[PDB]
Write an enzyme that holds these catalytic residues in place. Structure first.
Site, PDB file in Angstrom:
ATOM      1  N   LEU A  22       0.844  -1.184   0.000  1.00 47.62           N
ATOM      2  CA  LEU A  22       0.000   0.000   0.000  1.00 47.62           C
ATOM      3  C   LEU A  22       0.885   1.241   0.000  1.00 47.62           C
ATOM      4  CD1 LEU A  22      -2.753  -1.183   2.512  1.00 47.62           C
ATOM      5  CD2 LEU A  22      -2.700  -1.345   0.006  1.00 47.62           C
ATOM      6  N   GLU A  30      -8.851   1.405   8.811  1.00 44.25           N
ATOM      7  CA  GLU A  30      -9.183   1.198   7.410  1.00 44.25           C
ATOM      8  C   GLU A  30      -9.112  -0.298   7.135  1.00 44.25           C
ATOM      9  OE1 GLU A  30      -8.244   0.528   4.072  1.00 44.25           O
ATOM     10  OE2 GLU A  30     -10.181   1.430   3.564  1.00 44.25           O
TER      11      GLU A  30
HETATM   12  N1  LIG Z   1      -5.632   0.145  -1.732  1.00 40.50           N
HETATM   13  C1  LIG Z   1      -6.415  -0.862  -2.115  1.00 40.50           C
HETATM   14  O1  LIG Z   1      -7.806  -0.831  -1.918  1.00 40.50           O
HETATM   15  C2  LIG Z   1      -5.783  -2.053  -2.771  1.00 40.50           C
HETATM   16  C3  LIG Z   1      -4.448  -1.982  -3.129  1.00 40.50           C
HETATM   17  N2  LIG Z   1      -3.880  -2.940  -3.913  1.00 40.50           N
HETATM   18  C4  LIG Z   1      -2.458  -2.811  -4.271  1.00 40.50           C
HETATM   19  O2  LIG Z   1      -2.324  -2.851  -5.678  1.00 40.50           O
HETATM   20  C5  LIG Z   1      -1.229  -3.660  -6.055  1.00 40.50           C
HETATM   21  C6  LIG Z   1      -1.739  -4.868  -6.829  1.00 40.50           C
HETATM   22  O3  LIG Z   1      -2.727  -4.480  -7.759  1.00 40.50           O
HETATM   23  P1  LIG Z   1      -2.445  -4.623  -9.337  1.00 40.50           P
HETATM   24  O4  LIG Z   1      -1.064  -4.154  -9.591  1.00 40.50           O
HETATM   25  O5  LIG Z   1      -3.575  -4.024 -10.082  1.00 40.50           O
HETATM   26  O6  LIG Z   1      -2.470  -6.209  -9.597  1.00 40.50           O
HETATM   27  P2  LIG Z   1      -3.660  -7.288  -9.660  1.00 40.50           P
HETATM   28  O7  LIG Z   1      -4.115  -7.682  -8.308  1.00 40.50           O
HETATM   29  O8  LIG Z   1      -4.777  -6.788 -10.495  1.00 40.50           O
HETATM   30  O9  LIG Z   1      -2.934  -8.510 -10.404  1.00 40.50           O
HETATM   31  C7  LIG Z   1      -2.597  -8.376 -11.767  1.00 40.50           C
HETATM   32  C8  LIG Z   1      -2.673  -9.755 -12.402  1.00 40.50           C
HETATM   33  O10 LIG Z   1      -3.900 -10.350 -12.038  1.00 40.50           O
HETATM   34  C9  LIG Z   1      -4.498 -10.983 -13.148  1.00 40.50           C
HETATM   35  N3  LIG Z   1      -5.718 -10.219 -13.477  1.00 40.50           N
HETATM   36  C10 LIG Z   1      -5.997  -8.951 -13.036  1.00 40.50           C
HETATM   37  N4  LIG Z   1      -7.197  -8.567 -13.523  1.00 40.50           N
HETATM   38  C11 LIG Z   1      -7.699  -9.574 -14.265  1.00 40.50           C
HETATM   39  C12 LIG Z   1      -8.886  -9.695 -14.974  1.00 40.50           C
HETATM   40  N5  LIG Z   1      -9.760  -8.691 -14.989  1.00 40.50           N
HETATM   41  N6  LIG Z   1      -9.149 -10.860 -15.660  1.00 40.50           N
HETATM   42  C13 LIG Z   1      -8.230 -11.887 -15.629  1.00 40.50           C
HETATM   43  N7  LIG Z   1      -7.052 -11.762 -14.922  1.00 40.50           N
HETATM   44  C14 LIG Z   1      -6.785 -10.620 -14.245  1.00 40.50           C
HETATM   45  C15 LIG Z   1      -3.482 -10.940 -14.273  1.00 40.50           C
HETATM   46  O11 LIG Z   1      -2.662 -12.074 -14.136  1.00 40.50           O
HETATM   47  P3  LIG Z   1      -2.086 -12.927 -15.371  1.00 40.50           P
HETATM   48  O12 LIG Z   1      -0.815 -12.281 -15.864  1.00 40.50           O
HETATM   49  O13 LIG Z   1      -1.750 -14.309 -14.864  1.00 40.50           O
HETATM   50  O14 LIG Z   1      -3.127 -13.009 -16.466  1.00 40.50           O
HETATM   51  C16 LIG Z   1      -2.625  -9.747 -13.922  1.00 40.50           C
HETATM   52  O15 LIG Z   1      -1.304  -9.938 -14.369  1.00 40.50           O
HETATM   53  C17 LIG Z   1      -0.550  -4.113  -4.775  1.00 40.50           C
HETATM   54  O16 LIG Z   1       0.537  -3.267  -4.488  1.00 40.50           O
HETATM   55  C18 LIG Z   1      -1.617  -3.946  -3.717  1.00 40.50           C
HETATM   56  O17 LIG Z   1      -1.034  -3.581  -2.490  1.00 40.50           O
HETATM   57  C19 LIG Z   1      -4.620  -3.989  -4.371  1.00 40.50           C
HETATM   58  C20 LIG Z   1      -5.962  -4.086  -4.029  1.00 40.50           C
HETATM   59  C21 LIG Z   1      -6.554  -3.116  -3.225  1.00 40.50           C
HETATM   60  C1  LIG Z   2      -7.009  -2.488   3.762  1.00 44.11           C
HETATM   61  C2  LIG Z   2      -6.674  -2.169   2.303  1.00 44.11           C
HETATM   62  C3  LIG Z   2      -7.855  -2.083   1.578  1.00 44.11           C
HETATM   63  N1  LIG Z   2      -8.779  -1.174   1.910  1.00 44.11           N
HETATM   64  C4  LIG Z   2      -9.931  -1.076   1.229  1.00 44.11           C
HETATM   65  N2  LIG Z   2     -10.828  -0.161   1.586  1.00 44.11           N
HETATM   66  N3  LIG Z   2     -10.189  -1.890   0.194  1.00 44.11           N
HETATM   67  C5  LIG Z   2      -9.290  -2.813  -0.172  1.00 44.11           C
HETATM   68  N4  LIG Z   2      -9.490  -3.645  -1.190  1.00 44.11           N
HETATM   69  C6  LIG Z   2      -8.093  -2.936   0.515  1.00 44.11           C
HETATM   70  C7  LIG Z   2      -7.141  -3.907   0.139  1.00 44.11           C
HETATM   71  C8  LIG Z   2      -6.400  -4.674  -0.167  1.00 44.11           C
HETATM   72  C9  LIG Z   2      -5.451  -5.689  -0.591  1.00 44.11           C
HETATM   73  C10 LIG Z   2      -4.544  -5.961   0.426  1.00 44.11           C
HETATM   74  C11 LIG Z   2      -3.243  -5.487   0.328  1.00 44.11           C
HETATM   75  C12 LIG Z   2      -2.318  -5.749   1.331  1.00 44.11           C
HETATM   76  O1  LIG Z   2      -1.044  -5.272   1.210  1.00 44.11           O
HETATM   77  C13 LIG Z   2      -0.220  -5.630   2.325  1.00 44.11           C
HETATM   78  C14 LIG Z   2      -2.707  -6.494   2.440  1.00 44.11           C
HETATM   79  C15 LIG Z   2      -4.008  -6.975   2.538  1.00 44.11           C
HETATM   80  C16 LIG Z   2      -4.388  -7.710   3.653  1.00 44.11           C
HETATM   81  C17 LIG Z   2      -3.453  -8.014   4.635  1.00 44.11           C
HETATM   82  C18 LIG Z   2      -3.826  -8.753   5.752  1.00 44.11           C
HETATM   83  N5  LIG Z   2      -5.148  -9.195   5.883  1.00 44.11           N
HETATM   84  C19 LIG Z   2      -6.084  -8.887   4.891  1.00 44.11           C
HETATM   85  C20 LIG Z   2      -5.700  -8.153   3.775  1.00 44.11           C
HETATM   86  C21 LIG Z   2      -4.933  -6.703   1.536  1.00 44.11           C
END
Ligand SMILES: NC(=O)C1=CN([C@@H]2O[C@H](COP(=O)(O)OP(=O)(O)OC[C@H]3O[C@@H](n4cnc5c(N)ncnc54)[C@H](OP(=O)(O)O)[C@@H]3O)[C@@H](O)[C@H]2O)C=CC1
Ligand SMILES: CCc1nc(N)nc(N)c1C#CCc1cc(OC)cc(-c2ccncc2)c1
EC number: 1.5.1.3
Length: 186
Positions: A22, A30
């Site tokens: 993150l 959060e």
């Molecule tokens: N702040 C937040 O709410 C959240 C933060 N994050 C952060 O974002 C980063 C990761 O996200 P991101 O970089 O987007 O990576 P993703 O989690 O989206 O992973 C990317 C891979 O997932 C597969 N994939 C993703 N979307 C699809 C789809 N629609 N259909 C089929 N396959 C799919 C593909 O794999 P393949 O190559 O095998 O096809 C792609 O290479 C991390 O650093 C994490 O911490 C992630 C979620 C929430």
């Molecule tokens: C808390 C953020 C977050 N907030 C919100 N509002 N939506 C989301 N989708 C995510 C997210 C995410 C993805 C995510 C990234 C991550 O980076 C270390 C850790 C966790 C995680 C670690 C341990 N127990 C459960 C989850 C999850």
């Protein structure tokens, strides 16, 4: 199978990730919000389903995989089998949703939650039907390499309040944020 919901925490510069982590330092409440929103099922005997991309899956600390109390599904076209700790893998969001109707998942799943990352979010947002977006607006800029797709304000309504969710400004670690809930039904 119940609601279709996305959940994301996003910075002011629309950032959600940085180096497989993150962009911001750990925000305890959060995190608690994410956990309680994704884990809580409204139906006895059923669990919620979390759908995530491969990178999101691997960004979660190994000792926390799979996400406890929830059924975990990973999206990937390269993996031949679900990663260690997971039991479900799909080539796309559409395939996964279609999978939720098969007997192995049909009667065990309550809500469906997309928890990242970027392209999963995109595909979900453009997917037709009743969709809810739980968006944490983190009121600060952070260095990011992954981003949240902009919300089409012609498809979505921003709700002033949502049940169980506080609409006031939160603050931890000197960082202010706010819980928002967007909605569309098409
Ligand atoms: N702040 C937040 O709410 C959240 C933060 N994050 C952060 O974002 C980063 C990761 O996200 P991101 O970089 O987007 O990576 P993703 O989690 O989206 O992973 C990317 C891979 O997932 C597969 N994939 C993703 N979307 C699809 C789809 N629609 N259909 C089929 N396959 C799919 C593909 O794999 P393949 O190559 O095998 O096809 C792609 O290479 C991390 O650093 C994490 O911490 C992630 C979620 C929430
Ligand atoms: C808390 C953020 C977050 N907030 C919100 N509002 N939506 C989301 N989708 C995510 C997210 C995410 C993805 C995510 C990234 C991550 O980076 C270390 C850790 C966790 C995680 C670690 C341990 N127990 C459960 C989850 C999850």
């Amino acid at each position: 199978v119940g609601s279709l919901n996305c959940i994301v925490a996003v910075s002011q510069n629309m950032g959600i990730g940085k180096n497989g982590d993150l962009p911001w330092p750990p925000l305890r409440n959060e995190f608690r919000y994410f956990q309680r929103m994704t884990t809580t099922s409204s139906v006895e005997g059923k669990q919620n389903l979390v759908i995530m991309g491969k990178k999101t899956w691997f960004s979660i600390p190994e000792k926390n995989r799979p996400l406890k109390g929830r059924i975990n599904l990973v999206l990937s076209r390269e993996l031949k089998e679900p990663p260690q700790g997971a039991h479900f893998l799909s080539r796309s969001l559409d395939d996964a949703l279609k999978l939720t109707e098969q007997p192995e998942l049909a009667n065990k799943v309550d809500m469906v939650w997309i928890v990242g990352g970027s392209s999963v979010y995109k595909e979900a947002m453009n997917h037709p039907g009743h969709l809810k977006l739980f968006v944490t607006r983190i009121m600060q800029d952070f260095e990011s390499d992954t981003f949240f797709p902009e919300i089409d304000l012609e498809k979505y309504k921003l709700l002033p309040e949502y049940p169980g969710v506080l609409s006031d400004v939160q603050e931890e670690k000197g960082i202010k944020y706010k819980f928002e809930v967007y909605e569309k039904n098409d």
